[PDB]
Amino acid sequence: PKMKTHKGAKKRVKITASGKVVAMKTGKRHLNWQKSGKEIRQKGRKFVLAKPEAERIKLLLPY
Amino acid sequence: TRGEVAYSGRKIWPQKHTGRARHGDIGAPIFVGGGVVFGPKPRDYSYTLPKKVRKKGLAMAVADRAREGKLLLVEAFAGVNGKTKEFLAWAKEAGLDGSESVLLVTGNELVRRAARNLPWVVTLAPEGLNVYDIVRTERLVMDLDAWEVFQNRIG
Amino acid sequence: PRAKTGVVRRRKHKKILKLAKGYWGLRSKSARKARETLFAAGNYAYAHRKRRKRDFRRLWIVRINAACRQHGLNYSTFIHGLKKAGIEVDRKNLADLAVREPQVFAELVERAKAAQG
Amino acid sequence: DLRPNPGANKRRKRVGRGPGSGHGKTATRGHKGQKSRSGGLKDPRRFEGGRSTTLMRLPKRGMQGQVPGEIKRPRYQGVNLKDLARFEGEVTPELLVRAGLLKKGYRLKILGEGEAKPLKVVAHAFSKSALEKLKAAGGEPVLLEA
RNA sequence: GGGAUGACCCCAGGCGGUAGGGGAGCGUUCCCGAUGCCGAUGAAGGCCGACCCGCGAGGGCGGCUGGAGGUAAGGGAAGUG
RNA sequence: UGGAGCCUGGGAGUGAGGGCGCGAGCGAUAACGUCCGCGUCCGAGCGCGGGAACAACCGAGACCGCCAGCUAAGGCCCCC
RNA sequence: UGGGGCUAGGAGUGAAAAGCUAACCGAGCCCGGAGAUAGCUGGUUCUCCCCGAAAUGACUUUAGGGUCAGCCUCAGGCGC
RNA sequence: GGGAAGCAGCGCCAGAGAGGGUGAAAGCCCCGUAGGCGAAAGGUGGGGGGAUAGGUGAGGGUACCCGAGUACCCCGUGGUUCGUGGAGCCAUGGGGGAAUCUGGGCGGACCACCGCCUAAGGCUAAGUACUCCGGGUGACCGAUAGCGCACCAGUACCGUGAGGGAAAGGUGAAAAGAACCCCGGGAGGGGAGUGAAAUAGAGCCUGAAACCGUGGGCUUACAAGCAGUCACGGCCCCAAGGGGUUGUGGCGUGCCUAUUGAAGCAUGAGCCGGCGACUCACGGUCGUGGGCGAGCUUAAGCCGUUGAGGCGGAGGCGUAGGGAAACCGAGUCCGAACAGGGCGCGUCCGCGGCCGUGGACCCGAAACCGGGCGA
RNA sequence: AACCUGGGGAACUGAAACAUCUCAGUACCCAGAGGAGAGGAAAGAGAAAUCGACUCCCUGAGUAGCGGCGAGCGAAAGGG
RNA sequence: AGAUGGUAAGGGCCCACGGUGGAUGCCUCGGCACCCGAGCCGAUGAAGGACGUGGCUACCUGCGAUAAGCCAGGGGGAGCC
């Protein structure tokens, strides 16, 4: 009775005005050593599709 | 439910090489003795209707009635002193023979006492006007005090 | 409010058993053996109305042949004749003329072998 | 009005969906016909395969709180002057909660969009943009908490 | 398509079907309608029918049995087949 | 101009396939064997006609009714 | 061999079979936790109308279970 | 009419037309209902009155007292949202071990500032919990239902014991419960008689189905079958039409489940009746019938009603977005950047579909743990 | 009969294995109280130039936080 | 040289009337839920029992060797054991 928010999603993914699900590109916490400055440079956030409808459902109460 | 049922939990028979079918305990709902599946439990059916929508109706109710020409608000209660006879008479002077039913609304205890026992009367104080009572009757009669507190109940 | 079975079940049951009068043994007693029987009985009937239309095709044709073979020719020939002869008539049904009024059947055979030889 | 045809208009539809019959939703109950459709399934939203969620994505949304808790600091509620457009005289926070906007969400920040209007406006903050637009007649009662 | 929208007349197409999706109905118990309406000149239930109305689930009609209950039009709940 | 198509959303089931024809691998140019690829029919058309009988070979996509008429595969000595 | 006593459930007893411990002991019986759990097997109830699948791919302590894609359906919009 | 309370003629009460009873269906026949009364005795009882016990000031000086194996520190643990963590606070098994207001603890390691509170003695109504017990109500059940038990039930009966645990209600308004005769050892019947009714005659209302009989019509001893259907033809019963039966001819692989595929020699079912499986609560998300709209909406409670509704804005959603954050704001973030680039234009109730948490469509293990009972 | 405080205190299960974690201070055992019991007049809350014993309801809030940061668990102040 | 009629040990279908059995409907000294009220007893021997008690008495009920009952106060008014 009465849903609980999935703390480990809140802890890692913000949800936009339009209702899109936005988080940080994977693959750079010890990859590095020598990859292109291009690779590691290219880590800002992104969209996800279809699978965010699931994410969202879990951040019920807070929105 | 099959837990609120009286019986013991023991396994009625072995399960395996008995020849009968496989069973649990006898509180199970396939058991004629048994518990009952999706049965009623005590529950609360009430809900908060928009207070606005309550007002509209109360008002829309009295209107229809007045349109019919069946609303009559009054003042002079000569049929007083809590006696059925008196009211009876007063009511015929007003043109109420008991050929239609009447919601008689007033703050006056004694006029209320007088009617009541007539089958064609539903008596009621002004605080408790409500659309059900209004509709289930054919004709509506108000005291002026009663019509007042009805206007204050709107705006 | 409980709403127990009540009268309902019996009534669906004997609706059917009336439908089953006079089938052998348990098939007019039992309110489910009867059902199973009635299923096939249904299908059988549908299939068989279809069939009736065919069973009489055979009859009409079998005896026309008998009758017109009694004048020299055969059925194959006779029908071809009428076709050319312009008599969209007989209607195999209505060659019972062969039995009532063979006078007039005889006439039709002449017309037929008219267009045929 | 009579007691026949208070009849709820057009769409009440109380007709729920029952699956016991040989027409509509049979044997299996309108869905099902297999296994793990039988008293429970694992989620989904978040679950399954037994694979690796999409808890593979990380929390750079870092800075996420230590033991004694969150810190109690002052919070600011915005309101575009476009909304101030209605009412006239002197606008003051608390007079704004007594109306559609603000309520208890604490310190008022007037800011933003729409044409301004000649009057004194009491606040805790204005944006650059907002303060200028209030040049064509107005106020800078500011600071407060005093 | 008529278009005096008449839900009635005219024309032309579609209508095999498991898992499933969607749309209409029929029946069971209980509540308002009810201080009412039916009822011993016969309620409910039961037994018969080749009759009437529904595509159908069903609903009428008639005859026998039964002996005190039953409950419209229009709506509302569910231990509902 | 089609129970075509595209866009957004609510509800599913399925995730065990099978035979036939054609193109290859495995196998022994064996298997109602087994692996993929292109198509079909059964599945769900074990409804109907032909094939002696018979899911998938040939004919054909079954709203109901008729003691009317033309055909298809296959047939016209008797069973028929 | 009669009568009177003592030792019990990971415990007793055992000239040792995992034997015996109230007619089934590799851990007694009763009640409770309890409606344990059961990716497994079985069963699921009135009528008519329209549409109508799948047995593939990816990942899966996965392989008769799942999650996304694909194929069925309804509603809104777009209009060759 | 067996019986009036039905129907009809003419009346009356109502602060009483809740309900139950009377041979059927009654405001005025009975018991009641509205309304109003009543305790010698025992319980209860600041709700309303009285009486005690107990308690109420200010300065100025001394600095005598303010709860000890305690505070406090260290080691081992528990409580809290806190699982070693930057780990405080509150409790404490072990070791050390103070001070009496220039005394001592707390404000999340610690130090300094600024503040909060006085540990190591005790009591204290009310608001809250429950229901063996009594009363009132019911869009609760009506004898496989409802408690396990409507009935002499924790009974019979089962077990050494702890413990397990059923079945089984109904003549009639009134017993008027069939004197007497007849056959029979009786039990039963047949006359007679009571009754409106006796296939209401006593495990007696209604009395359905399986199952077992008797009587009547059609029908069968050279056939062969998922038991039927279509067509003719004969016989038998009210009339140019129907119903019953079946001689011959045509055609025809049970139901369910499970399956690539079942008449299948694959699963289930002797037959009949009755019981038997997608629910409810609270969140969520679409859809939909309404209300009000840049706004919409109340929760607990308080006042009424005794099947009446009002009040109550604490709160909640919405009106602005970006950023880990400081923050800025129609923008904002990475960036030195008037480069580029990412994100950035309603609510309440009803109804219906699906999801989360709870057995959550229903029946089923082998086992695991606790407390008892058995030599 | 329940209801209450103290001293002791499981496992099935969930984590789609399991050991920390969960079920849970639950089930259960024991002692004590009473028509209730517990608590209770600050060595308190926590940031307010603040409140002012204790208990109980609605909010706060699935928030702050805790967590093999998994499964999951989950406050207090403040306002009515 | 020829022919379709004709028997029922028994069997099948239909119709009528009974037997068994206890579904259905109607009925209710009983149950379930919620809300109110009320809330401890015991060494002055409880809760719970055993045995006993009637002119005649199996069981239930009530009582306790004073045993279906003994004393007094209050309530009621024609029937009781």
UniProtKB/Swiss-Prot annotation, chain A:
| Record SUPFAM superfamilies | L35p-like
GO BP: translation
Gene3D superfamilies tied to this protein: 4.10.410.60
- Record protein name field: Large ribosomal subunit protein bL35
Q: Which UniProt keywords apply?
A: Ribonucleoprotein, Ribosomal protein
Q: Which InterPro entries match?
A: Ribosomal_bL35 (IPR001706), Ribosomal_bL35-like (IPR021137), Ribosomal_bL35_CS (IPR018265), Ribosomal_bL35_sf (IPR037229)
What Pfam families does the annotation carry?
A: Ribosomal_L35p
State the oligomer form and interacting partners. Answer: Part of the 50S ribosomal subunit.
Q: Does the keyword Transcription apply?
A: no
PROSITE patterns, per this entry? RIBOSOMAL_L35 (PS00936)
GO CC aspect terms: cytosolic large ribosomal subunit
GO MF annotation list: structural constituent of ribosome
What family name appears in the similarity comment?
A: Belongs to the bacterial ribosomal protein bL35 family.
User: What stretches pass through the bilayer?
Assistant: none
Swiss-Prot record, chain B:
First and last residue of the signal peptide: none
- Asked if the keyword RNA-binding belongs to this entry, the reply reads yes
GO terms for biological process, alphabetical: translation
Q: Which GO terms describe its molecular function?
A: rRNA binding; structural constituent of ribosome
Q: Which UniProt keywords apply?
A: Ribonucleoprotein, Ribosomal protein, RNA-binding, rRNA-binding
Result for mutant: G3S: No effect on Ptase activity of hybrid ribosomes. No change in binding of a tRNA analog to the A or P site
Question: Impact of altering E4A?
Answer: Further decreases Ptase activity in E.coli hybrid ribosomes. Significantly decreases binding of a tRNA analog to the A or P site
Has UniProt tagged this entry with the keyword Ribosomal protein? yes
Q: Which GO terms describe its cellular component?
A: ribonucleoprotein complex; ribosome
Q: What is the effect of changing G3A?
A: Increases Ptase activity of hybrid ribosomes to a value greater than that of pure E.coli ribosomes. Increases binding of a tRNA analog to the P site
Q: Known post-translational modifications?
A: The N-terminus is blocked.
Could you give the subunit structure recorded for this chain?
Answer: Part of the 50S ribosomal subunit.
The entry assigns this protein to a family as follows: Belongs to the universal ribosomal protein uL4 family.
Its function, per the record, reads:
One of the primary rRNA binding proteins, this protein initially binds near the 5'-end of the 23S rRNA. It is important during the early stages of 50S assembly. It makes multiple contacts with different domains of the 23S rRNA in the assembled 50S subunit and ribosome. Forms part of the polypeptide exit tunnel.
What's the name of the protein?
Large ribosomal subunit protein uL4
Gene name for this UniProt entry: rplD
UniProtKB/Swiss-Prot annotation, chain C:
Question: The organism sits in which domain of life?
Answer: Bacteria
Q: Record's GO cellular component, any one?
A: ribonucleoprotein complex
Gene Ontology biological process: ribosomal large subunit assembly; translation
Q: Does the keyword tRNA processing apply?
A: no
Q: What SUPFAM superfamilies is this protein classified in?
A: Ribosomal protein L20
Concerning PANTHER family, the annotation shows: 39S RIBOSOMAL PROTEIN L20
- The name this protein carries in UniProt is Large ribosomal subunit protein bL20
User: What is the documented function of this protein?
Assistant: Binds directly to 23S ribosomal RNA and is necessary for the in vitro assembly process of the 50S ribosomal subunit. It is not involved in the protein synthesizing functions of that subunit.
Listed A to Z, the keywords are: Ribonucleoprotein, Ribosomal protein, RNA-binding, rRNA-binding
| Protein family membership | Belongs to the bacterial ribosomal protein bL20 family.
Q: Cite the GO molecular-function annotations of the record.
A: rRNA binding; structural constituent of ribosome
InterPro entries in alphabetical order: Ribosomal_bL20, RIBOSOMAL_L20_CS, Ribosomal_protein_bL20_C
UniProtKB/Swiss-Prot annotation, chain D:
Entry's Pfam families? Ribosomal_L27A (PF00828)
Listed A to Z, the keywords are: Ribonucleoprotein, Ribosomal protein, RNA-binding, rRNA-binding
GO biological processes: translation
InterPro entries noted in UniProt: Ribosomal_uL15, Ribosomal_uL15/eL18, Ribosomal_uL15/eL18_sf, Ribosomal_uL15_bac-type, Ribosomal_uL15_CS
Composition bias of kind Basic residues appears in 26-35
The answer on whether this UniProt entry bears the keyword RNA-binding reads yes
Which terms does the record give in the GO molecular function aspect?
Answer: rRNA binding; structural constituent of ribosome
Q: Composition bias, kind Basic and acidic residues: at what positions?
A: 40-49
The organism sits in which domain of life? Answer: Bacteria
Q: Which GO terms describe its cellular component?
A: cytosolic large ribosomal subunit
The similarity annotation says: Belongs to the universal ribosomal protein uL15 family.
On subunit structure and binding partners, the annotation says: Part of the 50S ribosomal subunit.
Quote the protein name from its UniProt record: Large ribosomal subunit protein uL15
Source organism of this protein record: Thermus thermophilus (strain ATCC 27634 / DSM 579 / HB8)
